[PDB]
Amino acid sequence: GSSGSSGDDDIEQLLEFMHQLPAFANMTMSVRRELCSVMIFEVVEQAGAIILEDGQELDSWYVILNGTVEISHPDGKVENLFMGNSFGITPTLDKQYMHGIVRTKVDDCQFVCIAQQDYWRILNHVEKSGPSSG
């Protein structure tokens, strides 16, 4: 990826942005940096794309990095989230099921996927402080 940004310390540059968002602020910095090491990089190019379907075993945490995402419910409700909001699963081992259909509102929408386990091994106080990457 050729883009104006530091190399030696890439995560750092990204961290600064993490703080900007509330969802990423709810947890101390350390947790943020750790997540960046256990979070996937994904960005939807074609707007109006489906992010999650109704009745799907949510096992990964999603966070709106850029763009707006609209959520639809089977009952007749439609939520509206904006850059900064979070959705997907909770930091608790407890799993959950999607109760609606998510769809982007604009193009060039960025997002991030984080495994539950790693999501409950950082924020929480599990035996392993950080992820094992070696």
UniProtKB/Swiss-Prot annotation:
Isoform 3 has highest expression levels in the brain, heart, liver, lung and placenta and is barely detectable in skeletal muscle, kidney and pancreas. A nucleoside 3',5'-cyclic phosphate binds at residues 23-128. It is found in: Cytoplasm; Cell membrane. Guanine nucleotide exchange factor (GEF) for Rap1A, Rap2A and M-Ras GTPases. Does not interact with cAMP. Interacts with the second PDZ domain of human PTP1e. This is Rap guanine nucleotide exchange factor 6. The gene is RAPGEF6.
